RNA sequence: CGCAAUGAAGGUGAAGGCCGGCGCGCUCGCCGGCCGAGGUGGGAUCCCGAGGCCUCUCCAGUCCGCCGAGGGCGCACCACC
RNA sequence: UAUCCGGUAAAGCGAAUGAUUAGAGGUCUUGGGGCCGAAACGAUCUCAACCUAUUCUCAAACUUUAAAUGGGUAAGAAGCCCGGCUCGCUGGCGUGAGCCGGGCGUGGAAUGGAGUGCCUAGUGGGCCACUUUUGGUAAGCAGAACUGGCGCUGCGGGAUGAACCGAACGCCGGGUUAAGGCGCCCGAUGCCGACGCUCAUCAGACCCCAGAAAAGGUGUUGGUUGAUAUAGACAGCAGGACGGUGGCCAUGGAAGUCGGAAUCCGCUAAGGAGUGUGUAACAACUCACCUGCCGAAUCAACUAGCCCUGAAAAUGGAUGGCGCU
RNA sequence: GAAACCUCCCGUGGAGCAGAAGGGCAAAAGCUCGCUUGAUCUUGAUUUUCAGUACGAAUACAGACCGUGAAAGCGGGGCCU
RNA sequence: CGUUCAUAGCGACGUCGCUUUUUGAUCCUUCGAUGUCGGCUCUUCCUAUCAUUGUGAAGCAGAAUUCACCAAGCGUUGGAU
RNA sequence: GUCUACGGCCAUACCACCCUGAACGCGCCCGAUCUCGUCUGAUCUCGGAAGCUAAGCAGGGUCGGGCCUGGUUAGUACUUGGAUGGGAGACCGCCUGGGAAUACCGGGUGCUGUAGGCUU
C-alpha cells in the first residue's frame, strides 16, 4: 500500500526542464486573468507556495476568483464514477492561458466578418466547418518520363 | 442478438388515478375524451393531474390564488387548481374570483362566494371552456411538505442544512460531537 | 493518369455478433446503428467518419456500393423511421410526409440523395431504418480475418457489391 | 486464510452503467468563496443601483426616441 | 495475403504532393494478387519498406491488371524470392515452366508451401523474368527442353471409383 | 401533533419598499402619504395577435375557423442575487 | 478540428549520475615493485590511480532525447456587438465587478427523447483468458493493471469439458449462415478436385490442449555460396614420397614424428623442415605433383522442409473410435 | 610537511540548505551580519486523505495588532513532500 | 586422464533433457472422519537388466571383465542387531 | 549605421583566443573635504574630469567548441486494434493504423519594446 503524501510521484512532474532552472521569468507573473478565463494548470518546482496538487496538473479549467497573487480556478476532477467540478486556489506561476478557446473566438470573429459582408451581396457563405472530404478527381501527368520500377530488395544479414 | 439495454424501456408515469372513487373517475372519463379530441394542452395537463397523488397535488391557499390573479393582465379569467382551495386567515380582502377545484374548504368557500365569486366543478369548467380558453392553471407549492426538509445532502455533511430525524429537539438531542467546534468537529 | 474521386459513400455491414465486444467498438457500432449482426447502413465518408470505421474494422465488412446496390437495398428492404416505428416504404406518401421538407418526395429522390450524398443526406439516411439483411448465401470466407488477408472484415471497396447481392 | 487484497476489476463497468455524468452546469453560479473584499463592494454597488434610477430610465427613453427617429429616417 | 490463382497487377502510386514537393515522382511495381483490393494493399507494403511512404501519405494513381502477352506460348520463368524460414530469412531462385507469369508465380506459391512449409505472408517475390532454353539452372525444367520428347503414362490409376461403386470387373491400368 | 424559530442560558423572536416632509438625506435620526411579501434566468400553461388560406366571377363585406410570425402575463420547480 | 498535459516502450551513455572492456596518448600526478644506474622526470620497462582523444558493454530506484495507446479543455443565445447607470473595492485620469436598455440566430462528423427526487433489496469469499506486470527454478502457485468472460447462461463447434471459437435463448414452418466439418461411426466431396512433400521394426493427423530439447543423419527434397574440368578431370587400381639435414629448441629421447618457436631453398615432376602408424631413437610403413586404363559431369561447405536417432514406468488403451499410405 | 594562514586564477553549483530520499534553490532558498517575534489575535472559503465524514497537514483570502525594509514588498513558523 | 592416443573405459569448464521410487513448493479435493509407520501374507505391472538366453566392445591371449544392444521369460535366498 | 537607460523572450544571446571601433555615450580614470563604509577609499559611498580605448562594452573573425534548426539514421526501433498465423519454447511474420532516438552530414550564430542620444 502506497503513501498518501501530497507530493508522492512528482519527481518528474514538478521539475523544471533541462536548462530552464532558476528565475521564473517575469511575463509569467505579469499577465492578467479575469473571471471566466480558460486556464490550464501546470505545477512548477521553483515556486512551492500555491502549488496545485498532482491531480490537477495537465487539467484545464475556468477562473472563478482572482486574489492578489493567485487565481481560484474551477476544474473537473473525476472520481471513480463521478466527475466533481471543484475549486482550487493556484498561485499564478502554475498557470497559463489555455489557447484552446482562442482559435474558437478567431473563428466566431471571422464568421461575424463573413456574416456582415455577404448580407448586402446576397450570396450566403459556409459558416459551419466541414471534415476533410474525399480528395476529389484529378489528373496526374507522368510528364515525359515513365514510372520508376521498385523491386523489393534481396535480404542479407548485416550484424 | 441485439444490443439495447432494456433497463429504462418501461416508462413509470401513471395512466389512471390509483384512487377508486367514482366521481373523480367520471372526471377522468370526461377529460380523457377532451384531452384526446381537443387540441387544447390544458386538457392534457388537467388530465395528467387527475391521476396524481394527494402529495403530488398540494393545497392552494386563498392568498396564493389571490396574488397569482393580482398579477398584471390575467383579469376577468378563471383560476384552476386540480387540488383544493384553502383559506388564508392572514388575508382579509378577497376579490371576486372565478375558480375551479376538485375541493374547496368550507371557509374558503364562504369567503369567495361572499365576495361575489363563482365556484366551479371540473365538469362545469369543461362545458364553460372545453379547450381551457381563458384559464389560469395554478398549482400549490409541491415542496411544502415538511418531508422535504429531511431530503438532500445528509446532516453532518459540510454545507448541508438538512433537518435530521430526531426524537425530540432540545439541549441534549444531538447538538454535541459534530455540531459544536468544542466537541470534536463541525460540518 | 486520371485518378478519379475518392468515394463519397459506403455501405457498412456488421459481420460479427454481439458478445464480448470492447466498449469503444461497441459505442461506435451503436453510432453507426449497427446493433444486430448483418445490419448495414450507408455512411458518408470523411476524415471523421472513416476513422470511426477504422476503430470498428474487425467488426464490419464495408465499401463502396454500386448504383444497383442502392436500388436493391432501398426497394427490397427500404423501411422508414416514421414516428419511431419501423415502417416499410410502401408508398411515397410515407417518404414525402417525412422528407418532403427537403425536396425528397419519392423513392427515386431518396435513392438520388443517398447515392450522390446530397445536402440532405443525413436526413434521408437517418430516415432509412438500418437494413436487416439475411445471412450471406454461399457463406463467407472467414469472419474473423481481414479481406486483404483472406477474411471478410474491413474495406473491400468494389467487392462490397458482391456481398450485397448474396445477402440482400 | 488470506484474501484478495485490492482491485479495480469490475469498477469501470459499474461506473458506466449510470453514465459518468458531467457536473450539471448552470448559468448563475454562486459567489461562495470569492475574495471577501470584492463581495462587500459588489454588495454595496448592488445596494445603490436604485439610486441613479431616474437618470437611467430617462437615458433609455432618449435612446428609444433616437431609435424611433432612426427607423423613421430609414423608412 | 492468401491466394487462389494470382494475377499480375501494375500499380503505380505517389507520395501525394505538398507545397515543398509539388510534382512528386511516380513509383510502379509488379504486384501479384488475387484481386486489385489486396493488390493495392500489397503495393503499399512494398513501398513502405523501400520509401518513406504510407497509404495515408500517398495516392495510388493507376492499379491495373496485366495480361500475359504470349498466353499460348509455353515459357520458362525464372523467379527470385525472399522467404522467411522458421529460422532466418532467405533468398532463392526458383524456376517454373508455364504459359504465364501469373501461373508461374501461383505455381511458386504452391511449391514453397509444399517444399518449405512457407505461407504466403512470409514470401516476397522480387523479380519474375521469362528466360531462354539456356539460362535455366534447374534440371527439373531442363528435361522438357527437347524436340522429340517422348514418354508414356505408365500406371494409369483410375478415377471414377464410384461410377460403379460395385462391379464385377476388376479394373485396368494398362493403356 | 400542527400553526416559529434560535440560544448552554438569562433571554430574544421573522418587512420590506417606495413617496413627501422635518433633522445637514449624514447611504445615520424623526414626522405625514402610497404600495405591500423583493429581483435575474429558465419555465407546462393562459393571453394578445401582424399576417395569411380559401369562398363558382369583380369588388364590398360582417360571421367561422385553421394555422400563426411577433409580443405579453407567467404556476410549480430549479439555479443565482 | 484546435489546444494543453505526460516521461513508459524505444533510444543514449565520444551528454550528467552510476556502472564497465580495450588499446593509442600523456615524467600531468605520484608512487610502489624492478632491470641498467652511487644517485639522477637519467635510460628502460612496469603496474597504481588521475588526465587527451578514441573504443567495448550496461541501469526498476540514471538520462540529454523520446514515441504509440492515453487525460484535460474548446467547437456560441448562458454567444457576440452597442448605449447608459451602481461601488464603502481599485486608482494620476483609469480599473474591475455588478446592474438596467436595446441590436443581432442553425456556427465540426455520427447517434440518441432528456432532466430530477424519494424509498430501496441482494452484495461486500470470487475466479478465468488476451495483452501488460511483481515475487518465485516453477506451479492447475501467490499478487496488480486493462478489457472481455465464467459466476447469473442455455444453444452450434472444440470427442469429453465453467472460462476456447462461433453465437447469446417466448412457442413453431420455410430459407441462410457462423465457428467447425464432409472414408464409416455421423448431417456433408460417391469432385474423374489442383500442385508438391513424406514411409516411420515409436509414422502423422488442427486455437485454448493435454506433450519434448540440445545435438546428430549422402534418409529424401529443395535452396545458398564456392569450386572443377578436355591444359579431357573426378573417383576406382598401379609408381615415388627426396635432399641442404641429427634443421633448431628440447638430452629424457624427437635426425618430419611426447610437446613448442619455427618453418625456407635445392632438385624440381615433386614431396610438408611433415597427416598419422609406430619407435628410447631410427628404421620400416603410411598420408602431394604427375601420368596408364576407363569415359561426363564431378565435389565441398553451409542452409531449411518432411522422415528418422536423441526418446525410460509401473491395471490393458486410446489422432475420440474404427481405420487410413 | 598531503592537511594550519594568506593571495591570484578557473569553477552551473560537482557544495550547502537539522533528518530519509525525491524535487527546488547562486547579486538564493547557501554563508555572514543588523534589526526582530507573522511560531501573535479572529471569521469563514478551499486543497489533500476522502464517504468526498473526521483528524493531521496544507492553499488562497479577509479583519486586527506587529516585525522588517529607503521602498515596492515579504512574514500569521521551519523551501516543498 | 588413460605410458603413447580427446571419446576401449573415462571426462573438467559449459550446456540440453527426462523422471516422480527423494525432499520441497503449492493448497485444488476431503474436517455430519477416506483408520494414521513398519513387518507378515498375496497378486500383478514397470525396466532405469544383478543373473539367466542371443549378440556387438575393449586398454578381450586364456581365466576374470567392465562398456553397449534385443530383452522383464524365469529368478533374485537363510540369519545376527 | 549605432549606442545609453529601463526592458520582453532568455546561448541563433554561452565560452576561448584574434582583429577593428568615427561621433555621442558607456567606461576605465584622478581624488577623499563632506555623506557612507572598510584591516585596507580595492569594493562600497561621495567630489571630480588630467589622461586613455589597454580592459570592460560593441561589430567582425575561427574548415573553433557549444547552442538552434534541417537531413540522415528509417518507415528502422517501438507501438493501437486482428486472426483457430507460425514456432516445442524463446520469440517471429503478416494484416490495421500511429511512428521515434544517437553516431554521420548540412545551414544558422540573437531578435525585438519604450524613452533618450550620436552619425547634425
Ligand atoms: Mg433482461
Ligand atoms: Mg477472437
Ligand atoms: Mg475480499
Ligand atoms: Mg514513472
Ligand atoms: Mg528502457
Ligand atoms: Mg461473505
Ligand atoms: Mg488462492
Ligand atoms: Mg456464488
Ligand atoms: Mg466469441
Ligand atoms: Mg530556511
Ligand atoms: Mg494579515
Ligand atoms: Mg595426455
Ligand atoms: Mg502433496
Ligand atoms: Mg475405506
Ligand atoms: Mg532397455
Ligand atoms: Mg579610488
Ligand atoms: Mg575598449
Ligand atoms: Mg582593443
Ligand atoms: Mg560551429
PDB file of C-alpha atoms (C1' of nucleotides) in Angstrom, chain G residues 136-139 141-142 211-214 258-259 277-278 312-316, chain I residues 4-5 15-21 24-28 44-48:
ATOM      1  C1'   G G 136       9.166 -17.236  -7.364  1.00  0.00           C
ATOM      2  C1'   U G 137      13.591 -22.632 -10.559  1.00  0.00           C
ATOM      3  C1'   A G 138       8.434 -23.269 -11.425  1.00  0.00           C
ATOM      4  C1'   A G 139       3.045 -24.344 -10.327  1.00  0.00           C
ATOM      5  C1'   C G 141       1.346 -21.037  -7.107  1.00  0.00           C
ATOM      6  C1'   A G 142       0.913 -16.071  -4.973  1.00  0.00           C
ATOM      7  C1'   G G 211       3.205 -33.013 -24.640  1.00  0.00           C
ATOM      8  C1'   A G 212       9.628 -32.893 -25.751  1.00  0.00           C
ATOM      9  C1'   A G 213      15.221 -30.228 -26.327  1.00  0.00           C
ATOM     10  C1'   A G 214      20.329 -29.649 -27.254  1.00  0.00           C
ATOM     11  C1'   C G 258      55.914 -36.885 -26.323  1.00  0.00           C
ATOM     12  C1'   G G 259      55.443 -31.110 -26.945  1.00  0.00           C
ATOM     13  C1'   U G 277      51.389 -45.798 -37.586  1.00  0.00           C
ATOM     14  C1'   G G 278      54.921 -46.755 -34.646  1.00  0.00           C
ATOM     15  C1'   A G 312      12.743 -44.839 -19.805  1.00  0.00           C
ATOM     16  C1'   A G 313       7.087 -46.512 -15.812  1.00  0.00           C
ATOM     17  C1'   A G 314       4.653 -49.154 -13.433  1.00  0.00           C
ATOM     18  C1'   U G 315      -4.174 -52.480 -14.360  1.00  0.00           C
ATOM     19  C1'   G G 316      -4.830 -53.141 -20.741  1.00  0.00           C
TER      20        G G 316
ATOM     21  C1'   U I   4      51.556 -43.343 -26.332  1.00  0.00           C
ATOM     22  C1'   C I   5      46.223 -41.926 -28.004  1.00  0.00           C
ATOM     23  C1'   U I  15      25.249 -26.863 -21.896  1.00  0.00           C
ATOM     24  C1'   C I  16      20.317 -29.533 -23.188  1.00  0.00           C
ATOM     25  C1'   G I  17      16.884 -33.111 -21.152  1.00  0.00           C
ATOM     26  C1'   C I  18      13.830 -36.884 -18.871  1.00  0.00           C
ATOM     27  C1'   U I  19      11.896 -38.982 -14.075  1.00  0.00           C
ATOM     28  C1'   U I  20       8.172 -38.625  -9.983  1.00  0.00           C
ATOM     29  C1'   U I  21      10.722 -44.921  -6.175  1.00  0.00           C
ATOM     30  C1'   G I  24      10.480 -29.255  -1.070  1.00  0.00           C
ATOM     31  C1'   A I  25       6.962 -25.554  -3.161  1.00  0.00           C
ATOM     32  C1'   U I  26       1.554 -25.297  -3.569  1.00  0.00           C
ATOM     33  C1'   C I  27      -3.314 -25.920  -1.080  1.00  0.00           C
ATOM     34  C1'   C I  28      -7.438 -27.916  -5.897  1.00  0.00           C
ATOM     35  C1'   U I  44       0.074 -58.118 -10.655  1.00  0.00           C
ATOM     36  C1'   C I  45       2.752 -54.452 -13.528  1.00  0.00           C
ATOM     37  C1'   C I  46       7.327 -51.410 -14.874  1.00  0.00           C
ATOM     38  C1'   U I  47      12.573 -51.510 -16.508  1.00  0.00           C
ATOM     39  C1'   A I  48      16.161 -47.300 -15.417  1.00  0.00           C
TER      40        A I  48
END
